[PDB]
Amino acid sequence: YVPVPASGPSRKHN
Amino acid sequence: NLEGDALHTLRVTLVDPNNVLQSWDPTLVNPCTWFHVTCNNENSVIRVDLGNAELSGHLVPELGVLKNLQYLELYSNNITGPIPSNLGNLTNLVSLDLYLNSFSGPIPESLGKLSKLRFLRLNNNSLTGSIPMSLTNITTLQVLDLSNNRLSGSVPDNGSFSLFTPISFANNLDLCGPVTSHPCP
Amino acid sequence: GSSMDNQDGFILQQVKLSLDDPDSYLSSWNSNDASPCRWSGVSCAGDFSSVTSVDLSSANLAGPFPSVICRLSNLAHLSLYNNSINSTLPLNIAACKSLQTLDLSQNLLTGELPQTLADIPTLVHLDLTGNNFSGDIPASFGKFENLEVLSLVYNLLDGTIPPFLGNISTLKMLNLSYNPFSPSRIPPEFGNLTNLEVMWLTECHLVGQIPDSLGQLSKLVDLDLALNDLVGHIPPSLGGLTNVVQIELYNNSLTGEIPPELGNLKSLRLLDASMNQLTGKIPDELCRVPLESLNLYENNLEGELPASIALSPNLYEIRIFGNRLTGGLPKDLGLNSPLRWLDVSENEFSGDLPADLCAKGELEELLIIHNSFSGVIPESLADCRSLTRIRLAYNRFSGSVPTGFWGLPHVNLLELVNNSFSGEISKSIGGASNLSLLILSNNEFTGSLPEEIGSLDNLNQLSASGNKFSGSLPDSLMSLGELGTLDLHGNQFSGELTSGIKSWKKLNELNLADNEFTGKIPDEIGSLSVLNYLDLSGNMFSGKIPVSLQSLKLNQLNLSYNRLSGDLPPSLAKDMYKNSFIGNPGLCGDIKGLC
Ligand SMILES: *[C@@H]1O[C@H](CO[C@@H]2O[C@@H](C)[C@@H](O)[C@@H](O)[C@@H]2O)[C@@H](O[C@@H]2O[C@H](CO)[C@@H](O[C@@H]3O[C@H](CO)[C@@H](O)[C@H](O[C@@H]4O[C@H](CO)[C@@H](O)[C@H](O)[C@@H]4O)[C@@H]3O)[C@H](O)[C@H]2NC(C)=O)[C@H](O[C@@H]2O[C@@H](C)[C@@H](O)[C@@H](O)[C@@H]2O)[C@H]1NC(C)=O
Ligand SMILES: *[C@@H]1O[C@H](CO)[C@@H](OC2O[C@H](CO)[C@@H](O[C@@H]3O[C@H](CO[C@@H]4O[C@H](CO)[C@@H](O)[C@H](O)[C@@H]4O)[C@@H](O)[C@H](O[C@H]4O[C@H](CO)[C@@H](O)[C@H](O)[C@@H]4O)[C@@H]3O)[C@H](O)[C@H]2NC(C)=O)[C@H](O)[C@H]1NC(C)=O
Ligand SMILES: *[C@@H]1O[C@H](CO)[C@@H](O[C@@H]2O[C@H](CO)[C@@H](O[C@@H]3O[C@H](CO[C@H]4O[C@H](CO)[C@@H](O)[C@H](O)[C@@H]4O)[C@@H](O)[C@H](O[C@H]4O[C@H](CO)[C@@H](O)[C@H](O)[C@@H]4O)[C@@H]3O)[C@H](O)[C@H]2NC(C)=O)[C@H](O)[C@H]1NC(C)=O
Ligand SMILES: *[C@@H]1O[C@H](CO)[C@@H](O[C@@H]2O[C@H](CO)[C@@H](O[C@H]3O[C@H](CO[C@H]4O[C@H](CO)[C@@H](O)[C@H](O)[C@@H]4O)[C@@H](O)[C@H](O[C@@H]4O[C@H](CO)[C@@H](O)[C@H](O)[C@@H]4O)[C@@H]3O)[C@H](O)[C@H]2NC(C)=O)[C@H](O)[C@H]1NC(C)=O
Ligand SMILES: *[C@@H]1O[C@H](CO)[C@@H](O[C@@H]2O[C@H](CO)[C@@H](O[C@@H]3O[C@H](CO)[C@@H](O)[C@H](O[C@H]4O[C@H](CO)[C@@H](O)[C@H](O)[C@@H]4O)[C@@H]3O)[C@H](O)[C@H]2NC(C)=O)[C@H](O)[C@H]1NC(C)=O
Ligand SMILES: *[C@@H]1O[C@H](CO)[C@@H](O[C@@H]2O[C@H](CO)[C@@H](O[C@H]3O[C@H](CO)[C@@H](O)[C@H](O[C@@H]4O[C@H](CO)[C@@H](O)[C@H](O)[C@@H]4O)[C@@H]3O)[C@H](O)[C@H]2NC(C)=O)[C@H](O)[C@H]1NC(C)=O
Ligand SMILES: *[C@@H]1O[C@H](CO)[C@@H](O[C@@H]2O[C@H](CO)[C@@H](O[C@H]3O[C@H](CO)[C@@H](O)[C@H](O)[C@@H]3O)[C@H](O)[C@H]2NC(C)=O)[C@H](O)[C@H]1NC(C)=O
Ligand SMILES: *[C@@H]1O[C@H](CO[C@@H]2O[C@@H](C)[C@@H](O)[C@@H](O)[C@@H]2O)[C@@H](O[C@H]2O[C@H](CO)[C@@H](O)[C@H](O)[C@H]2NC(C)=O)[C@H](O)[C@H]1NC(C)=O
Ligand SMILES: *[C@@H]1O[C@H](CO)[C@@H](OC2O[C@H](CO)[C@@H](O)[C@H](O)[C@H]2NC(C)=O)[C@H](O)[C@H]1NC(C)=O
Ligand SMILES: *[C@@H]1O[C@H](CO)[C@@H](O[C@@H]2O[C@H](CO)[C@@H](O)[C@H](O)[C@H]2NC(C)=O)[C@H](O)[C@H]1NC(C)=O
Ligand SMILES: *[C@@H]1O[C@H](CO)[C@@H](O)[C@H](O)[C@H]1NC(C)=O
Ligand SMILES: *[C@@H]1O[C@H](CO)[C@@H](O)[C@H](O)[C@H]1NC(C)=O
Ligand SMILES: *[C@@H]1O[C@H](CO)[C@@H](O)[C@H](O)[C@H]1NC(C)=O
């Protein structure tokens, strides 16, 4: 099972 | 960033029973707040400290992307597989400490490209083959331990290797040379 | 009568014989049954014995698509989701002429898409996600009569994105994300998909400009063009997306300004145009929209964050780091919204932190590093127990830390580095059950390290360099067995190290340099299994260097400028250690310039 990232905001953070 | 991406690649090919790599969040701007990672003032990795963490698995060539890494501390683990040749791309490395592991295969000749290396401890592994002559070109080398391996062939006595003593090359499968006191064919 | 008889049970026994079933999902498929309706995965709508749906999802079934199943006359819904179905998808799938739903997602299907999928007139839902399909999308796909959902996500499709997909009038979702498509522009024709609610084109190697046509999609709810090489401006045409709730344009090469026309989007709640080259100011009209989430980080944006953004009752996420934004954060930020994630780092923001960032009690991440913020930490944040990550470093902050702020129970990282913070570490630090990293370096902190710091069993890093901390190390500090870094350099710490240091079995770095420590280095120093960096320089450490030091494999040693006396163990009398023992008059070794 290749998990597929949902359509949504990017999550890059400090 | 690229450096964090490279270390995350190591996390996924490593086996981590104690979850020592849990803080390694690849969504962070950089790996500098990751436990076991130290960065310089320019936020570039200079240290990976993962000694005696009960880590299993293989290293990745992606480690060679860490151009400011100075201290690679992966000693006292159960890491198997070969020393990735790409470790020779770590231009600023001062310490390569892969000792007390299950590493196999040859010491990459690429390791002679580490012109700033001072500490090379590969002892207590299953390493085979001859000791690369390129290691003699590391003028900065001060500490060498290739003991308790399955190494064979001539032990260099020139360049950086002239100062080294027998305890550095002890318990190898068939080492020959002046340090060995067994002359080579 | 005879007209209405079927062999559905016999067809299904042929499906069963054609598939590997290691977990016996099909054991219920008993040919002695009068009807297959009770069989696992089988539903028959109406009293009629006709099979109408087969759901074999997550059954761990392996082998090719069983084309014989098309002989079920009334089969309207088929799912083989999350199985090991393999090989090419046969052109004879079109024999399944009654199919409304086809879900073959998460399988091992390979080869080209069969153009005959377009010859099932009843087909409403087609899902081939998580397969190995390759080559061009067939021209037949422009001719789907009733298709509402086309999902080809996470395949190996290597052709250009086809304009003919804009000819499917009934389409509600076009999901083509995560395909290694040949570089292609967004076809303007996609603006003719008048019923479209979802355009998901993430990581499709898209190039060129967002077409103005896309503004014609009045029913669109999700526009997602993220992870592509799109260039040009975010079009003002996107103000025509009357029903849009989410716009994702992050990680592109977009330039120009955020159009004020995004303010016309009444239903818009989520916008992420991060990782672009956007310039100018965030428009007040966009901020007036009650957004749940706004991400515009790593852009070239300037000017002030409009105060209007603090009016939103829905805002939980603002990530605008890596910009040149100036001025103050809105005074009422967090007062009217359940703010959870705030990241305004790497900006030129100034003034006091807003007082009520955590009024709704949900703030987890406060990330404001590399700004010019001044004043004291708001006292309200002492009650913000939801916080998990605090990064206030590289600001112009001053004053005591509020007592309660040290004791927040879910904080994992507390970083107050490079400020002018003063006062002491409160005894309240004992309540910080989740604290792993404490970084207080380059402040004006004073006082003894409280004994309660020893109660932090999971603490991994204590870095408090460049402060005015004083007193003997608390005994409890030596009970911290998870500690890998202790950096207390450039302080006024006094007293002796004890034998309790042997409990620092996980400690990699001990930096006690530039302090007022006295007494002997304990013999338990050699019992630290993972210690590679030792700096005790610039202290008043006295007595003989322990022989146990020779046990360690240090990459960094400095005992310089102390009151150490005696001989160097001959293993330390090496040229490499020439700058490790300087300024010890009592100390005599065989190193040039020593003794
Ligand atoms: C598509 O999948 C089919 C089902 O396979 C299983 O699922 C796939 C995705 C993989 O995970 C497989 O590892 C898994 O088995 C494939 O067909 C099946 O193919 C196997 C051969 O791999 C067939 O087995 C022969 O089966 C007979 C009867 O059971 C065995 O007696 C025989 O014997 C030995 O098995 C021992 C095991 O200890 C081996 O050590 C020894 O070497 C022998 O192989 C064979 O295993 C299996 O019956 C068959 N299953 C079904 C339901 O048909 C399918 O592969 C293709 O077709 C087979 C006949 C063969 O020609 C193979 O090379 C083909 O590729 C696969 N298709 C593709 C394109 O990948
Ligand atoms: C995609 O499809 C997968 C099917 O291939 C599916 O997978 C599996 O996941 C389920 C649920 O997480 C697993 O569940 C149970 O099976 C247990 C038996 O199994 C195992 O032991 C072997 C060692 O021989 C090992 O290799 C396996 O990994 C398993 O550990 C069983 O004990 C357990 O019991 C209970 O739950 C049932 C469920 O209702 C309940 O009625 C019982 O009373 C009891 O409480 C589960 O039944 C299954 O083992 C996994 N199988 C495989 C092949 O991976 C994926 O979850 C699915 N993915 C998605 C996203 O849908
Ligand atoms: C330890 O360190 C020493 C010192 O650096 C290394 O020795 C040198 O190795 C390099 C290659 O690794 C040698 O490079 C070559 O130069 C040749 C010409 O050399 C002569 O003439 C010049 C100019 O007057 C002198 O300075 C020089 O000393 C020689 O007399 C080229 O012909 C070589 O080239 C070819 O092959 C390469 C592919 O490998 C092709 O890409 C090229 O096009 C070309 O055909 C090469 O470039 C260098 O000469 C060596 N110097 C000395 C003094 O020996 C050791 O190799 C190093 N490692 C080990 C294991 O000991
Ligand atoms: C083509 O692409 C589109 C876009 O990627 C795909 O559709 C979108 O698909 C997702 C995945 O199913 C949908 O998911 C969710 O949203 C619904 C609806 O609800 C809301 O309200 C609840 C109430 O509190 C709130 O919690 C939600 O945040 C949301 O506001 C949820 O019901 C649903 O579920 C929960 O999801 C959790 C996260 O996975 C689960 O853990 C929970 O157990 C629970 O089930 C989920 O959050 C989107 O709604 C949908 N978007 C649109 C605009 O349609 C589409 O599926 C895809 N199709 C194919 C075939 O590829
Ligand atoms: C975080 O805070 C730390 C500590 O406050 C800070 O580091 C300090 O940085 C400055 C500048 O980068 C360092 O200064 C050098 O300091 C030495 C004294 O040891 C001076 O001799 C040097 O030179 C001077 O002469 C120059 C002549 O033109 C003058 O222009 C200059 O002002 C000096 O007079 C030089 O300044 C200082 O030593 C460190 N201190 C410590 C403890 O490291 C760090 O830069 C801050 N980081 C960020 C990102 O803000
Ligand atoms: C101490 O601090 C750490 C670091 O901040 C805390 O850690 C982490 O916990 C997160 C939430 O439990 C966890 O998040 C997610 O990723 C998981 C997969 O890697 C995923 O399974 C989770 O699931 C969804 O999670 C939400 C949580 O709100 C649920 O509501 C949903 O139902 C889903 O299950 C999360 O997406 C994160 O991975 C983890 N981070 C690290 C770096 O370890 C930790 O909880 C703190 N402890 C205490 C006691 O406060
Ligand atoms: C754009 O979408 C159009 C609407 O679906 C599509 O038109 C349709 O095309 C099919 C296939 O040619 C026609 O199908 C069938 O019925 C005719 C009757 O004359 C038969 O001759 C055919 O063999 C076949 O059974 C539809 O009649 C036709 N529908 C409509 C409403 O016009 C276009 O082909 C699509 N264009 C592109 C470029 O993809
Ligand atoms: C969106 O469709 C417009 C209308 O057109 C057509 O009819 C459809 C039912 C379908 O069969 C499709 O294949 C046809 O293009 C289209 O405008 C077109 O009509 C004008 C006359 O009003 C004509 O001059 C023009 O050439 C037609 N356009 C094309 C592309 O053929 C409109 O252009 C299209 N949107 C685009 C391309 O962005
Ligand atoms: C040490 O002495 C080595 C043997 O003569 C020498 O080795 C090699 O380098 C030469 C000249 O560059 C190569 O032609 C030859 O292939 C190399 N031999 C082997 C066995 O690898 C080293 O370069 C010498 N080291 C120093 C520091 O001078
Ligand atoms: C490094 O490797 C050597 C060689 O395998 C280890 O030495 C042996 O240790 C056993 C006990 O485990 C002794 O009984 C042998 O006599 C030792 N053999 C030799 C040749 O010395 C050594 O323990 C390893 N080092 C570490 C730190 O584990
Ligand atoms: C070092 O990196 C370069 C890429 O910059 C690569 O070509 C070279 O082969 C690498 N060396 C090793 C030994 O992997
Ligand atoms: C995926 O497709 C490629 C190219 O068509 C093929 O070579 C490969 O075998 C396929 N992979 C799997 C997992 O079947
Ligand atoms: C952005 O895209 C580049 C490739 O163009 C990729 O390397 C990078 O990791 C991406 N980052 C994010 C957070 O999407």
Numbering used by the authors:
A (entry chain CCC): 70 to 83
B (entry chain BBB): 27 to 211
C (entry chain AAA): 12 to 606
Excerpt from the paper describing this PDB structure:
Here we demonstrate that HSL1 binds IDA/IDL peptides with high, and CLE peptides with lower affinity, respectively. Ligand sensing capability and receptor activation of HSL1 require a SERK co-receptor kinase. Crystal structures with IDA/IDLs or with CLE9 reveal that HSL1-SERK1 complex recognizes the entire IDA/IDL signaling peptide, while only parts of CLE9 are bound to the receptor. Our work reveals that HSL1 is a receptor for IDA/IDL signaling peptides.
The vastly different binding affinities between IDA/IDLs vs. CLE9 to HSL1 prompted us to determine co-crystal structures of four HSL1-IDA/IDL-SERK1 ternary complexes with: IDA, IDL1, IDL2, and IDL3 (at 2.31 Å, 2.38 Å, 2.20 Å, and 2.70 Å, respectively) and the HSL1-CLE9-SERK1 complex at 2.87 Å. IDA/IDLs adopt a fully extended conformation in the structure. The co-receptor SERK1 interacts with the C-terminal region of the different IDA/IDL peptides (residues 68-69 in IDA), completing the peptide-binding pocket using its N-terminal loop region. Our calorimetry experiments reveal that SERK1 binds HSL1 in the presence of IDA/IDL peptides with a dissociation constant (Kd) of around 15 to 50 nM, indicating that IDA/IDLs promote a high-affinity association between HSL1 and the co-receptor SERK1. Taken together, our quantitative binding experiments demonstrate that HSL1 is a bona-fide IDA/IDLs receptor and uses SERK proteins as co-receptor kinases for high-affinity ligand sensing.
